[PDB]
Design a protein around this motif. Structure first.
Motif, PDB file in Angstrom:
ATOM      1  N   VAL A  34     -30.173  -7.232  80.144  1.00 17.97           N
ATOM      2  CA  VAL A  34     -31.046  -6.859  81.260  1.00 17.97           C
ATOM      3  C   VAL A  34     -32.223  -7.811  81.402  1.00 17.97           C
ATOM      4  O   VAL A  34     -32.809  -8.234  80.413  1.00 17.97           O
ATOM      5  CB  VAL A  34     -31.495  -5.369  81.202  1.00 17.97           C
ATOM      6  N   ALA A  47     -34.977  -5.179  88.471  1.00 16.03           N
ATOM      7  CA  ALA A  47     -34.227  -5.132  87.212  1.00 16.03           C
ATOM      8  C   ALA A  47     -32.798  -5.592  87.502  1.00 16.03           C
ATOM      9  O   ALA A  47     -32.145  -5.070  88.414  1.00 16.03           O
ATOM     10  CB  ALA A  47     -34.221  -3.715  86.648  1.00 16.03           C
ATOM     11  N   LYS A  49     -29.049  -6.423  85.732  1.00 13.38           N
ATOM     12  CA  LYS A  49     -28.110  -6.335  84.612  1.00 13.38           C
ATOM     13  C   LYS A  49     -27.117  -7.502  84.713  1.00 13.38           C
ATOM     14  O   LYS A  49     -26.700  -7.861  85.820  1.00 13.38           O
ATOM     15  CB  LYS A  49     -27.371  -4.995  84.619  1.00 13.38           C
ATOM     16  N   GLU A  87     -33.824  -1.204  91.136  1.00 14.26           N
ATOM     17  CA  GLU A  87     -35.266  -1.093  91.028  1.00 14.26           C
ATOM     18  C   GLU A  87     -35.737  -1.117  89.579  1.00 14.26           C
ATOM     19  O   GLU A  87     -35.005  -0.715  88.669  1.00 14.26           O
ATOM     20  CB  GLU A  87     -35.832   0.084  91.820  1.00 14.26           C
ATOM     21  N   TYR A  88     -36.924  -1.698  89.373  1.00 13.42           N
ATOM     22  CA  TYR A  88     -37.533  -1.836  88.057  1.00 13.42           C
ATOM     23  C   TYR A  88     -38.595  -0.777  87.849  1.00 13.42           C
ATOM     24  O   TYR A  88     -39.428  -0.538  88.719  1.00 13.42           O
ATOM     25  CB  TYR A  88     -38.079  -3.264  87.845  1.00 13.42           C
ATOM     26  N   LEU A  89     -38.534  -0.130  86.687  1.00 18.84           N
ATOM     27  CA  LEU A  89     -39.450   0.911  86.243  1.00 18.84           C
ATOM     28  C   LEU A  89     -39.992   0.384  84.918  1.00 18.84           C
ATOM     29  O   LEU A  89     -39.260   0.311  83.930  1.00 18.84           O
ATOM     30  CB  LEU A  89     -38.697   2.257  86.110  1.00 18.84           C
ATOM     31  N   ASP A 135     -32.542   9.059  77.365  1.00 17.46           N
ATOM     32  CA  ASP A 135     -32.183   7.620  77.402  1.00 17.46           C
ATOM     33  C   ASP A 135     -31.873   7.141  78.823  1.00 17.46           C
ATOM     34  O   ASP A 135     -32.033   5.958  79.117  1.00 17.46           O
ATOM     35  CB  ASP A 135     -31.004   7.291  76.437  1.00 17.46           C
ATOM     36  N   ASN A 136     -31.473   8.066  79.707  1.00 13.99           N
ATOM     37  CA  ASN A 136     -31.107   7.736  81.084  1.00 13.99           C
ATOM     38  C   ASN A 136     -32.158   8.166  82.107  1.00 13.99           C
ATOM     39  O   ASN A 136     -31.891   8.226  83.314  1.00 13.99           O
ATOM     40  CB  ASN A 136     -29.712   8.294  81.401  1.00 13.99           C
ATOM     41  N   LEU A 138     -35.742   6.869  83.408  1.00 16.02           N
ATOM     42  CA  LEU A 138     -36.676   5.743  83.425  1.00 16.02           C
ATOM     43  C   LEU A 138     -37.984   6.167  84.058  1.00 16.02           C
ATOM     44  O   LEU A 138     -38.011   7.057  84.917  1.00 16.02           O
ATOM     45  CB  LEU A 138     -36.059   4.472  84.071  1.00 16.02           C
ATOM     46  N   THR A 148     -30.871   7.212  85.817  1.00 13.90           N
ATOM     47  CA  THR A 148     -29.960   6.066  85.828  1.00 13.90           C
ATOM     48  C   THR A 148     -28.629   6.432  85.114  1.00 13.90           C
ATOM     49  O   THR A 148     -28.445   7.595  84.711  1.00 13.90           O
ATOM     50  CB  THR A 148     -30.650   4.765  85.303  1.00 13.90           C
TER      51      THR A 148
HETATM   52 CL1  LIG Z   1     -30.495  -1.075  81.280  1.00 12.34          CL
HETATM   53  C1  LIG Z   1     -31.424   0.174  80.507  1.00 12.34           C
HETATM   54  C2  LIG Z   1     -32.639  -0.108  79.893  1.00 12.34           C
HETATM   55  C3  LIG Z   1     -33.111  -1.557  79.862  1.00 12.34           C
HETATM   56  N1  LIG Z   1     -34.394  -1.696  79.151  1.00 12.34           N
HETATM   57  C4  LIG Z   1     -35.597  -1.428  79.791  1.00 12.34           C
HETATM   58  N2  LIG Z   1     -36.730  -1.487  79.089  1.00 12.34           N
HETATM   59  C5  LIG Z   1     -37.917  -1.264  79.663  1.00 12.34           C
HETATM   60  C6  LIG Z   1     -37.963  -0.961  81.018  1.00 12.34           C
HETATM   61  C7  LIG Z   1     -36.745  -0.881  81.728  1.00 12.34           C
HETATM   62  N3  LIG Z   1     -36.793  -0.560  83.064  1.00 12.34           N
HETATM   63  C8  LIG Z   1     -35.753  -0.528  84.000  1.00 12.34           C
HETATM   64  C9  LIG Z   1     -34.354  -0.635  83.835  1.00 12.34           C
HETATM   65  C10 LIG Z   1     -33.799  -0.523  85.069  1.00 12.34           C
HETATM   66  C11 LIG Z   1     -32.347  -0.529  85.494  1.00 12.34           C
HETATM   67  C12 LIG Z   1     -31.299   0.136  84.602  1.00 12.34           C
HETATM   68  C13 LIG Z   1     -31.337  -1.392  84.751  1.00 12.34           C
HETATM   69  N4  LIG Z   1     -34.802  -0.351  85.952  1.00 12.34           N
HETATM   70  N5  LIG Z   1     -36.010  -0.362  85.268  1.00 12.34           N
HETATM   71  N6  LIG Z   1     -35.599  -1.144  81.102  1.00 12.34           N
HETATM   72  C14 LIG Z   1     -33.369   0.938  79.296  1.00 12.34           C
HETATM   73  C15 LIG Z   1     -32.905   2.250  79.317  1.00 12.34           C
HETATM   74  C16 LIG Z   1     -31.676   2.524  79.936  1.00 12.34           C
HETATM   75  N7  LIG Z   1     -30.917   3.666  80.129  1.00 12.34           N
HETATM   76  C17 LIG Z   1     -29.774   3.310  80.782  1.00 12.34           C
HETATM   77  N8  LIG Z   1     -29.806   2.036  81.040  1.00 12.34           N
HETATM   78  C18 LIG Z   1     -30.934   1.486  80.528  1.00 12.34           C
END
Ligand SMILES: Clc1c(CNc2nccc(Nc3cc(C4CC4)[nH]n3)n2)ccc2nc[nH]c12
Length: 284
Positions: A34, A47, A49, A87-89, A135-136, A138, A148
């Motif tokens: 990512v 964000a 992948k 989208e980024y969180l 875990d899913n 954000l 997610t």
């Molecule tokens: Cl890929 C993924 C992560 C990647 N690592 C991460 N770290 C810090 C911040 C952040 N933000 C994100 C990610 C995303 C979109 C899904 C890719 N948008 N914002 N992601 C983490 C938990 C997940 N749980 C499921 N998938 C997950």
């Protein structure tokens, strides 16, 4: 494998290296990988992948037709281990928050409401997520709560409104999923109930056990018990019982749980930003 060409069918055109710039790695060895990047024309941070390709097809297809403010929205996809823009969180996952911080009832109620808003949208569109867990979830830097991971999704219909496969993560799975019985959207409600236990106790029940022993314990024990229920308000205890009800007909739907008195004590989403700061400090 003709499934590779059905994937290639609607996923482009255009070079992603020109649309987005400033690619910064944030991914792990889960797949991977990512990255964050910025939209050149609007300035939006995004964000991106980078075994089973059908989960990727399902991810894209389910995501682009089920866009909602409480879902980590799919933005675009490109060429070629594939390039999926969403989208980024920046606040990261709810996992770091549940394991490193103590959440009050106001903050828990706020997270439950946002997750239930996403679930009522998915269930009304006949989509069962089947993999609800911290875990899913954000978190936005403003306290935004978004769902997610649409890989393990099941699209139902009146003709075949039930599934019976063992899909999800053991600790968050409803007993009807575990015991291979005919199940529906209310399995997500059970998983949310398990996620509220993570928010209270830091872990889902039986995490110290192996995943198969946990699978057995869910099948034989049924409704999990809190270590200290006396610490919670009667209204929160009632919300949990309605999430973790053994009887599927008695278990609350997302629509009716959105009307639960527990959600009336929900704090503004801004109340989550100190939790994110604490979780980042604890995991730094
Ligand atoms: Cl890929 C993924 C992560 C990647 N690592 C991460 N770290 C810090 C911040 C952040 N933000 C994100 C990610 C995303 C979109 C899904 C890719 N948008 N914002 N992601 C983490 C938990 C997940 N749980 C499921 N998938 C997950």
């Amino acid at each position: 494998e003709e499934i590779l060409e059905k994937l290639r069918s609607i996923v482009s055109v255009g070079d992603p290296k020109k649309k987005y710039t400033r690619f910064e790695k944030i991914g792990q060895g889960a797949s991977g990988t990512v990255y964050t990047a910025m939209d050149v024309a609007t300035g939006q941070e995004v964000a991106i992948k980078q075994p089973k390709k059908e989960l990727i097809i399902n991810e894209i297809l389910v995501m682009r037709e089920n866009k909602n403010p409480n879902i980590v929205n799919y933005l675009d996809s490109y060429l070629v281990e594939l390039w999926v823009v969403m989208e980024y969180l920046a606040g990261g996952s709810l996992t770091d928050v549940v394991t490193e911080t103590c959440m009050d009832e106001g903050q828990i109620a706020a997270v439950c409401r946002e997750c239930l808003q996403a679930l009522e949208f998915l269930h009304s569109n006949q989509v069962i997520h089947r993999n609800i867990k911290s875990d899913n979830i954000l978190l936005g830097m403003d306290g935004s709560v978004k769902l997610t991971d649409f890989g393990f999704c099941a699209q139902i219909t009146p003709e075949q409104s039930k599934r019976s496969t063992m899909v999800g993560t053991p600790y968050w799975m409803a007993p009807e999923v575990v015991t291979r019985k005919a199940y529906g959207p209310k399995v997500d409600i059970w998983s949310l109930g398990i996620m509220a236990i993570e928010m209270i106790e830091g872990e889902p029940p039986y995490l110290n056990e192996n995943p198969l022993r946990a699978l057995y314990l869910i099948a034989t024990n049924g409704t999990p018990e809190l270590q200290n229920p006396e610490k919670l308000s009667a209204i929160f205890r009632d919300f949990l019982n309605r999430c973790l009800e053994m009887d599927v007909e008695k278990r609350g739907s997302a629509k009716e749980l959105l009307q639960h008195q527990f959600l009336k004590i929900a704090k503004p989403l801004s109340s989550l930003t100190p939790l994110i700061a604490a979780a980042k400090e604890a995991t730094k």
